[PDB]
Design a protein around this ligand. Structure first.
Ligand SMILES: O=c1ccn([C@@H]2O[C@@H](COP(=O)(O)O)[C@@H](OP(=O)(O)O)[C@@H]2O)c(=O)[nH]1
Ligand SMILES: O=c1ccn([C@@H]2O[C@@H](COP(=O)(O)O)[C@@H](OP(=O)(O)O)[C@@H]2O)c(=O)[nH]1
Ligand SMILES: O=c1ccn([C@@H]2O[C@@H](COP(=O)(O)O)[C@@H](OP(=O)(O)O)[C@@H]2O)c(=O)[nH]1
Ligand SMILES: O=c1ccn([C@@H]2O[C@@H](COP(=O)(O)O)[C@@H](OP(=O)(O)O)[C@@H]2O)c(=O)[nH]1
Ligand SMILES: O=c1ccn([C@@H]2O[C@@H](COP(=O)(O)O)[C@@H](OP(=O)(O)O)[C@@H]2O)c(=O)[nH]1
Lengths: 346, 347, 347, 347, 347
């Protein structure tokens, strides 16, 4: 089990597949090379804070099956995975500091049954054999599975998962998992939650008739359809570009609509996967800009159900919503019975 | 009360340095600044400058985030340094000027623009900032931009566009066209009348006049016939000649924009910096026509038409100076038999 | 008279090394070359090679700026080194060969290709440069390209496309189709008749034969009946099977281009280099079907059908060898009941 | 109120981190911390650790500057971490332990030793610091040193020497011999009686008993005759055999010290860390006798004499455990014909 | 079965690569190799070569741990590569040769010295390793060393000293004086009769002949009269002239050793490598006399006097050639009036 053996697997199998054999490796700067037909060819560039040869081995041993997005694992408090590596493609780095029975340099244990693992929240995969029963034995852990497990009440997860860095709703493969959580040896009854859609501006696809209507109808016609007058969707979702300080624009679907009409620039000054993102946005057409614009990608149907169930009387209040298995705080301003603004917080 | 962990706190919370109090844990590895979020390192900044990583990180965090003049304009007006701000050169991914004033203990030659070391340096003043207006009139060398009029100073209207967080744009919700005032050796100078480059690119090129709309839509012959351009080698200078191994002409960006919709090509920017004239190693994919140094300037097509129609065709070779972006750009004017052979700008 | 500051002078003024005289100030930090332009540092080159930064910089500046054979062609033909030039591998962003001849004092193993150390090595000769044709006569091992006839040597027509500054193109204002010649231990070897890959990509894919046009517009079932491909597993090999967790087939680039036209997918090039056969880690965004190693070749679909129709369908597993890009590409052929199960190349 | 510019201020003014307020300008390049003095950069710290430069810089500045136990003693007592201080490992030029407590936001697993994450870790407590005494008696796993006696706890007297700013010394103006108390799983443990290594080196080796004075001055035969060491292979184990190509014995530092005054030799420390037993690749200059792995322990010669005289000569080969520096060191005892063949410690 | 973690396992347990099985965790940061020892990182190797860090680490671990010829000897004898071993250049802290044979898959040009690529290269053969003697018979070009007779080949006695793990020594428990043999294109060449340098240093200089003893104790004037060196400029060439701003003479190491015995001086080795003649930038601390290039050779003073007495004193300037360490060392000889002005070697 060597660096030369890990590079052999990457070359011949695209990742670490347990096949033995070795190829020559040159390590220069943060880059792993190998000679192919007399010349050097880059196999990996380290963009982690780990040693180059260690990050390289973790990347080769990344889980290449559909796995939960990193933000779901973080919201559930996961500290470490059991016998695999979750590659965080947002940061091009391992999702967790340590490993369990993966790499001799990062292993704090070889099996999740060891003492150092008991206080940590360990992620278990029900597709790996025996890991289901290991989750019950674990004191603090989180489990996914593709089918019901006897003795546990599932909590249905998102439709999307991550497959080699591609977030997708699987058709040829299952990507919706049942979730289970234990804390201090006590099983948790996970709260019913809204899920974020994990979409982007370029390839945005609507996922309900209301989202289709939002992309097709005019602003005042859509607000008339779903009777959102006084809920300030014009500000919150569509965004106001009239002043130098950009207003609202907190729903990704609204960002996608604007981007389709006119380009803008988004600075992700904290590049990582989280339920709420904060962007520094500069609108190229108008020049309207905002240093911190919080954006969340809820299904528009879910966002409507959330804002329609609020108290329009209090001028300022903080509201918590269970999204992606965590409590997201929203700042709700009001004035004379109508919504001023409504945005999430990271 | 200035430090590395404080700069990173402002970056994480306010998107940039806002003067807030606070600290976050930072680890410096290679040329990259990281910070910890839920137990894992997240990259905040990758140093692409020739300055030390923690220094450039701080200067980037303190960049001006209002609409500011493009670096090429400040270079052409002789600016050596800015007053109490950092103009981030997004073309080079590095600060625009070597030193700073009242910004960073590492790079500060002075803490206020009134110090003696600044007198021989042309200092940039932003009239939108309070007191910066008064600091210009008692500065020896300087350049001032403002929005309104300055009492007793005649304004030179600058370009329509400015740069905002690296995005060049003609502002609508914010003003990006400034008045320009320059002072040399303590005495106010009369800025010459000047053309301005349009500061566009190929991917999102849009015409800004009727003639430019006709250029993109009409055929080469039809355009030359309508605007009476016979004898000015527009087929060569603007449209470009792709018939030979050496590519001919193609010195106007709109010529590249028109060709780009028909066929892709490669533009190597071997001197990646902001300037009024850009040199490119161009390789056209359709024909294989290429040229090592192909100088390109983005002028409004009507402006280029006016410039070349005012020239004299009698001399076989000639160098013509034209004030563009407040600087004297040289043009070579090859002529033969009373018609323009070519007309290319020099970098 | 070779100087680092002189190489940088040529890059700034001529876009590449053109033998001009002069120098400019140069900084070297990390694996990056900078130069001072009007007071500030400007990046000229970022070293991605395993060579010293100043050395790699000099080889990049002295790269061949004429249409040259693609690196996959030179590799298949056994080329070990070029004569008095640098073939830049833009797929690797590095020199294509380990050593040089009469190019750079730090990598040169000889100043002329006639020296003793070069005799056991296959030297690439460019017939367009004067004297290189006769150098090919005096060399034991070598590969010569010309755009014309050489007296007494049978020509082998090469691919229509060459590489010009990293752009793979079929030339119209310059010629990219060369006559190839080869020598081994002094004897002029007859090159084999070969197919050539088309060297296209997904984003800019354009059909090149009437059959390839019919592949893109017409439905899957209509195309197979129109060209009598029944039993040849075109449903699997060219179109792809995304119903299963493991992706099936999809070994023709034109098949990926048709899928990419309607639905995005992921292509990890875990061995980034130029070759006739590429291996990709493919992940389909719509279905989630994925394959760790998917061998893909861009043959003209007409060439692919005549290759697959000619093989016999009796044996359950047969390793067919076909000559593509002057090399023995091995194909794995699975058969059952007189029809094709799958047919894929190997790297 | 913690930052990089503040750490550097304390380093420049107080020689180390003293908790003073202030800031100095810092630039980070490579693995080195610099600061400006009269316009030029001066190196404050060169990161030799595997931690980020600014992190190790801060941990170094916060190193304990009082006499502290040598790292090898803490390793042998099972210490995983220290409480509210940094034990700098001057042998490795890096922190002795992975994590910290109440020291540095980057490396802190906790801010006080009473947090839950510390319970399974053996924490080091310095009784010379106020309250650290009370923090030991309510800690699950821990190791405590103090100067006086602890009421109701029986003390285990430790070595005479401690380390002070990287200098191992037997203190005269300051006390360096400590009482040692260890607690495992909440219950106090009885530390075994133990020998202690002398922690000397060759350059400044001084004898610490009469027998060691006789060893350095007397001839090999005269010493063995006076202290009645026939049969214990002192010629081999201690004096060393340089007659063969493979060097024999030489497992006692005083043997190397005596040989060093007669003739120089090379000691390659291929595992450069502090430990009770050191392995060296030794090459003797006079004879050319060498050995790849030569284990060396610096025991008081009287202690080694006592150890080997208590053994049983009847068994041909035997592994003997000896408590040195609070750990069980294994020895191989080869015997033949009733006399010791050799006796070497194992690392 | 070559593994990076396996090479590190051998370094930790065997002090070098000894073919043992096993692995240890390894970190690679900067040009440094670390390993985890009981929770913390320990440095095992710091790369000073121009080779990749993991590659240089593997060559260092596989270095020859037997007495080998000094690098200056192997260089003078034209050695280009070693057979199935690594000669480590401790003067450069790098491999002595560019490539390897059957040592490391990343630097190997062949697995056996008999392959075609090695025929034009001079391969170093160690007669102590079984089979290497006959490999020297089958090789076109090579250099063989033995500590015994080989049937049918005239031996050439080599220097008394060899290198053992960077220590240059005359062996007593092992033999460092070898018989040398050489082949060129298949024929066994007769090696020339030669002097050998003594390879001593200033700090550990010890005389090796009665004349050299008399050089150290006796005064300058007594020594010259005792050995009839009048008119041979021993006052200048060996003792040195420090009265002038430009230092004079001092080309014999024994002369520097005598000066260093009484007064320190500075020796800048601006070309740090092993060679028969060294060039130093010398600065005397007492007088301030200095020389930019001072060529120094450590010949036995007896060998130097018989070289200088034999040359004729008629010609004003003559370039004498003398065979030292199997190479043609060129000496510059200045004469006047039948006496020596100066006499110095060149590099
Ligand atoms: O009296 C106030 C003060 C603030 N706000 C809201 O708070 C802002 C966000 O916070 P901030 O910019 O730090 O002040 C704006 O929300 P939005 O434009 O992002 O939707 C919006 O003005 C009010 O609605 N009434
Ligand atoms: O009789 C000549 C000779 C040269 N030129 C012009 O001078 C060249 C500048 O480039 P160069 O050849 O390196 O000197 C070409 O400029 P372009 O417009 O094609 O870009 C153009 O041919 C002429 O117009 N008539
Ligand atoms: O009895 C066999 C064994 C293998 N194959 C083929 O070989 C596979 C590729 O290799 P593998 O997946 O490692 O087995 C598949 O081809 P394809 O989907 O890549 O086009 C296809 O199953 C057969 O057709 N019959
Ligand atoms: O019949 C034997 C065989 C071995 N030994 C001992 O075991 C060796 C340990 O090293 P090694 O040879 O690698 O196993 C030597 O230890 P030392 O005291 O010289 O250092 C020593 O010779 C004997 O004493 N009698
Ligand atoms: O007519 C000459 C010219 C040169 N030399 C010798 O050559 C010098 C070395 O070279 P340089 O100083 O560059 O001239 C001195 O020798 P030394 O002091 O190094 O031993 C010495 O002057 C003469 O003796 N007669």
């Amino acid at each position: 089990m060597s660096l030369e053996n890990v590079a052999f697997n990457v070359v011949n199998k695209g990742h670490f597949d347990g096949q033995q054999g070795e190829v020559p490796v040159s390590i220069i700067n943060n880059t792993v090379y190998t000679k192919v037909d007399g010349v050097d060819v880059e196999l990996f560039e380290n963009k982690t804070t780990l040693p180059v040869n260690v990050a390289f081995e973790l990347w080769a041993k990344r889980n290449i099956k559909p796995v939960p997005e990193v933000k779901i694992l973080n919201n559930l408090g996961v500290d470490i995975a059991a016998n695999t590596v979750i590659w965080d493609y947002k940061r091009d780095a391992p999702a967790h500091i340590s490993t369990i029975g993966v790499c001799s340099m990062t292993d704090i244990a070889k099996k999740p049954t060891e003492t150092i693992c008991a206080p940590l929240t360990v992620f278990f995969d029900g597709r790996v054999d025996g890991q289901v029963d290991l989750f019950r034995n674990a004191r603090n852990g989180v489990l996914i599975t593709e089918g019901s497990v006897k003795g546990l009440q599932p909590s249905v997860g998102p439709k999307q998962a991550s497959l080699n860095g591609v977030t997708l709703i699987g058709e040829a493969v299952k990507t919706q998992f049942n979730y289970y959580k234990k804390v201090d040896g006590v099983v948790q009854q996970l709260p019913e939650t809204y899920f974020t859609q994990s979409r982007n501006l370029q390839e945005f696809k609507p996922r309900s008739q209301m989202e289709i209507d939002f992309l097709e109808l005019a602003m005042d016609e859509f607000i008339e359809r779903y009777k959102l007058e006084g809920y300030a969707f014009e500000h919150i979702v569509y965004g106001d570009f009239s002043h130098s300080q950009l207003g609202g624009l907190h729903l990704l679907i609204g960002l996608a609509k604007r981007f389709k009409e006119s380009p803008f620039e988004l600075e992700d000054f904290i590049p990582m996967d989280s339920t709420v993102k904060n962007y520094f946005i500069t609108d190229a057409q108008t020049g309207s800009s905002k240093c911190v614009c919080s954006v969340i990608d809820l299904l528009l149907d879910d966002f409507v159900e959330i804002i329609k169930s609020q108290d329009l009387s209090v001028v300022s209040k903080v509201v918590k919503v269970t999204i992606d298995y965590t409590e997201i705080s929203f700042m709700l301003w009001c004035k004379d019975g109508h919504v001023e603004t409504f945005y999430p917080k990271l």
